[PDB]
Amino acid sequence: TSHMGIRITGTGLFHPTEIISNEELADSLNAYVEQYNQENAEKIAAGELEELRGSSAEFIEKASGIKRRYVIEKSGILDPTRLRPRLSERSNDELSIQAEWGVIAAKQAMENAGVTAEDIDVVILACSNMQRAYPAVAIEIQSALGIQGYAYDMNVAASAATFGLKQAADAIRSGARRVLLVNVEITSGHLDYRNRDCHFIFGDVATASIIEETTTKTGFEILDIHLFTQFSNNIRNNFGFLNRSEDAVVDDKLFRQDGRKVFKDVCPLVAKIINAQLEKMQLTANDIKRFWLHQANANMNELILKYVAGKDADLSRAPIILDEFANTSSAGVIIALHRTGHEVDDGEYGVISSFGAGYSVGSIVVQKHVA
Amino acid sequence: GIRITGTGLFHPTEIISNEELADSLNAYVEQYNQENAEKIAAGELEELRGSSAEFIEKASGIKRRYVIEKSGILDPTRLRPRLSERSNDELSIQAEWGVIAAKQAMENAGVTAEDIDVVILACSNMQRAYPAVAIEIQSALGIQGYAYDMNVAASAATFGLKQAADAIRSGARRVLLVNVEITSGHLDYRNRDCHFIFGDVATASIIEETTTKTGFEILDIHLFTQFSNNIRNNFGFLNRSEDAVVDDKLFRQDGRKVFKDVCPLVAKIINAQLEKMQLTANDIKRFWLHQANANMNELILKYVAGKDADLSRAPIILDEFANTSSAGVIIALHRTGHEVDDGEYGVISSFGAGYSVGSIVVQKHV
Numbered sequence: 001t002s003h004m005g006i007r008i009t010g011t012g013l014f015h016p017t018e019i020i021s022n023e024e025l026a027d028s029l030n031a032y033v034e035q036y037n038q039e040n041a042e043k044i045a046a047g048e049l050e051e052l053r054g055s056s057a058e059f060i061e062k063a064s065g066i067k068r069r070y071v072i073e074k075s076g077i078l079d080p081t082r083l084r085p086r087l088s089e090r091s092n093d094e095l096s097i098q099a100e101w102g103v104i105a106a107k108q109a110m111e112n113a114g115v116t117a118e119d120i121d122v123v124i125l126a127c128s129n130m131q132r133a134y135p136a137v138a139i140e141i142q143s144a145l146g147i148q149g150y151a152y153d154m155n156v157a158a159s160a161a162t163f164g165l166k167q168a169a170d171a172i173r174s175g176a177r178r179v180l181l182v183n184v185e186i187t188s189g190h191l192d193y194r195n196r197d198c199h200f201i202f203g204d205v206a207t208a209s210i211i212e213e214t215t216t217k218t219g220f221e222i223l224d225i226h227l228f229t230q231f232s233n234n235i236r237n238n239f240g241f242l243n244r245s246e247d248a249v250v251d252d253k254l255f256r257q258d259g260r261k262v263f264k265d266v267c268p269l270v271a272k273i274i275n276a277q278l279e280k281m282q283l284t285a286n287d288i289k290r291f292w293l294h295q296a297n298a299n300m301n302e303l304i305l306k307y308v309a310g311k312d313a314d315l316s317r318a319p320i321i322l323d324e325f326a327n328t329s330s331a332g333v334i335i336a337l338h339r340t341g342h343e344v345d346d347g348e349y350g351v352i353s354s355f356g357a358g359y360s361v362g363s364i365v366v367q368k369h370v371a
Numbered sequence: 372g373i374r375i376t377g378t379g380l381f382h383p384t385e386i387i388s389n390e391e392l393a394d395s396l397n398a399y400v401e402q403y404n405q406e407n408a409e410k411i412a413a414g415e416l417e418e419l420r421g422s423s424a425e426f427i428e429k430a431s432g433i434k435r436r437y438v439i440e441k442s443g444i445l446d447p448t449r450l451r452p453r454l455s456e457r458s459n460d461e462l463s464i465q466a467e468w469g470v471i472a473a474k475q476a477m478e479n480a481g482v483t484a485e486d487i488d489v490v491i492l493a494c495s496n497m498q499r500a501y502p503a504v505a506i507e508i509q510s511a512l513g514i515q516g517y518a519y520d521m522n523v524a525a526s527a528a529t530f531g532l533k534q535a536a537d538a539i540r541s542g543a544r545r546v547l548l549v550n551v552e553i554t555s556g557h558l559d560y561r562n563r564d565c566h567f568i569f570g571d572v573a574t575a576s577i578i579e580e581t582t583t584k585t586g587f588e589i590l591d592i593h594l595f596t597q598f599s600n601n602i603r604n605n606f607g608f609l610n611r612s613e614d615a616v617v618d619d620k621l622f623r624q625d626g627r628k629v630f631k632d633v634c635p636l637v638a639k640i641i642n643a644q645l646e647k648m649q650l651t652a653n654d655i656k657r658f659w660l661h662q663a664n665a666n667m668n669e670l671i672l673k674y675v676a677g678k679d680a681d682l683s684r685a686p687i688i689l690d691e692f693a694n695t696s697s698a699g700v701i702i703a704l705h706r707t708g709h710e711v712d713d714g715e716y717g718v719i720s721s722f723g724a725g726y727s728v729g730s731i732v733v734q735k736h737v
């Protein structure tokens with residue numbers, strides 16, 4: 001009863017068209033590993049450097065549940081002479097790529113919510129990486145849509161959507177009418193496509209949500225929010241604007257992870273959060289029609305789902321979209337909600353729970369209202 | 372009832388005066404021109420122009436600034452601070468500065484780590500994307516709850532104060548707001564138009580639900596953004612995939628156009644806010660304005676107050692720190708909030724890149 005009338009009333013989804021199957025990608029890494037492992041063969045049999053392993057489509061799917069992923073530009077990523085998208089600098093007078101994707105997803109969420117630019121007071125860009133420091137990309141999006149009010153960029157990586165939803169609900173509580181929350185994840189821009197353990201994890205996407213105070217629109221009423229962060233170096237990327245002054249050389253300016261430590265750390269934390277949240281609301285797990293969990297690893301989600309809802313929880317109650325999208329970082333829970341929110345009936349309960357880098361966890365109990 | 376109950380400030384040790392900086396750039400532009408005698412004459416490359424300490428101070432009021440590392444900035448063969456990578460086990464530079472300012476703010480507010488529910492890092496440039504350095508600051512301080520990074524450049528502190536106030540109204544007890552500005556990391560020291568503008572600093576503030584603690588109670592907030600390319604830095608994580616070649620990956624601005632747009636917008640927002648709160652300029656003890664250019668602040672204060680407006684009513688710290696982007700208003704509040712007595716009013720107004728403007732009416736309580 002903290003957010004009476006505050007509802008997610010529309011979502012929108014954009015992905016780039018080109019697709020990389022697990023096989024195209026595992027092949028690409030394999031080529032690069034075969035040429036690196038023989039270019040440096042004199043030093044491989046010398047204890048000095050490195051021994052590179054490849055991978056296969058079946059190794060990816062069993063570690064993750066991922067099958068394919070959308071990407072901004074497929075040639076450069078798959079090319080073993082490059083291993084990164086082939087993009088072109090845009091002039092200042094055109095929409096940046098991040099603004100461009102955000103606008104596409106935003107127009108869809110606005111149409112789904114039945115609102116236009118004049119109805120929106122706040123724009124939040126919340127994702128794991130921003131294309132530039134200033135002017136804020138959220139302000140670029142606000143201006144492209146013709147929105148008046150104010151906008152800002154916000155980063156807490158994997159949990160940026162749930163943290164942003166709280167910030168949206170807070171701004172509405174204090175007087176905002178409606179908030180546009182945008183998540184643009186171009187993860188192919190900071191993915192290390194050379195590493196077998198992480199090159200498959202992420203895909204590209206833009207999501208958007210409309211949050212409004214309303215007693216007359218269909219949407220998900222926000223009932224309770226628990227945000228949590230606890231510093232961890234087990235996921236980290238050291239690229240930044242001070243690298244040039246550091247004359248940096250350490251090859252750690254991309255995604256890096258100790259996935260085993262993350263697995264062991266994150267699943268118990270998330271399950272503890274959700275269960276304490278359910279007890280606080282006096283809901284049982286059986287009262288929850290849908291768990292929209294972070295969309296990174298089906299093996300994590302299955303563990304959490306069993307910890308929270310029981311070994312016999314039906315799989316339809318925890319929709320998986322990472323099979324199609326791979327990990328879209330902050331946008332994951334929103335994709336899942338965008339695809340399956342229609343599966344929740346009026347009066348029924350759902351839980352949105354992000355978790356990942358920073359160690360950040362964000363968990364939101366919602367209830368559907370159909371008008 | 373929400374009050375700013377404590378502020379904290381940190382600046383690095385080494386100081387650069389305008390003449391050191393002008394000397395340094397003049398040496399670079401002469402080496403550049405003494406080299407390319409041909410392409411200047413060939414109508415290909417333009418002849419770079421130098422700088423003068425006299426212009427800097429008359430145009431802006433800045434006299435000196437604190438820098439993270441001095442010799443690399445002044446070196447005409449380098450023109451950027453000399454820094455070292457730290458391993459993940461060590462506190463990063465941005466978190467380190469933020470921790471120092473935060474401890475001072477916490478001590479000034481009479482609160483400890485267990486008292487804080489949210490940490491916001493709000494500034495114009497984050498040292499990395501993930502893990503958020505606000506979470507690194509939260510952990511270093513032993514604070515529990517949650518933390519996030521937030522960027523709206525010049526107005527990050529005022530937007531962050533609004534986000535802090537909103538979280539408290541939703542049930543947070545107290546919020547720590549940190550602004551760390553290592554502008555020497557993204558300034559273009561080759562460009563005479565902008566090399567003198569920015570300095571380095573960190574600031575912090577404690578915001579609390581209280582009616583019993585000395586602080587500035589927040590009474591109204593107006594935030595505004597309007598996209599403009601007149602201040603822009605195109606550096607980012609997609610440059611690599613772009614195979615970028617254009618030399619626009621540092622601070623860049625058209626200063627005259629910024630003045631024409633932002634000055635009347637600021638005067639209009641502050642005046643509209645005083646009307647809504649049924650205050651007059653005469654009711655405002657102190658205006659803590661963005662600390663970028665003293666001449667502009669003076670002109671803004673004349674269009675808001677009146678011909679007889681004491682210049683002391685708009686404190687200046689940019690003479691000492693230069694432009695400190697998001698932290699500027701907080702240095703002003705920290706250095707001169709003691710000059711506001713019980714029941715008196717103040718205005719905090721940040722403005723600049725994005726275009727962004729944030730304006731806050733406060734009232735002191737003792």
Ligand SMILES: CC(C)(COP(=O)(O)OP(=O)(O)OC[C@H]1O[C@@H](n2cnc3c(N)ncnc32)[C@H](O)[C@@H]1OP(=O)(O)O)[C@@H](O)C(=O)NCCC(=O)NCCS
Pocket residue numbers: 421422423426427430431563564625626627629630633634635637663664667668671722723
């Ligand atoms: C950046 C700023 C200090 C420059 O001051 P200014 O009075 O506007 O200077 P101008 O851009 O008009 O140019 C002044 C002249 O001196 C020259 N000049 C510029 N920098 C110089 C320098 N460091 N040294 C010597 N001469 C310089 C210029 O070339 C120009 O001559 P030109 O146009 O024939 O080439 C000022 O414009 C500013 O603060 N802009 C930002 C405003 C803001 O942030 N908020 C607005 C508050 S309302």
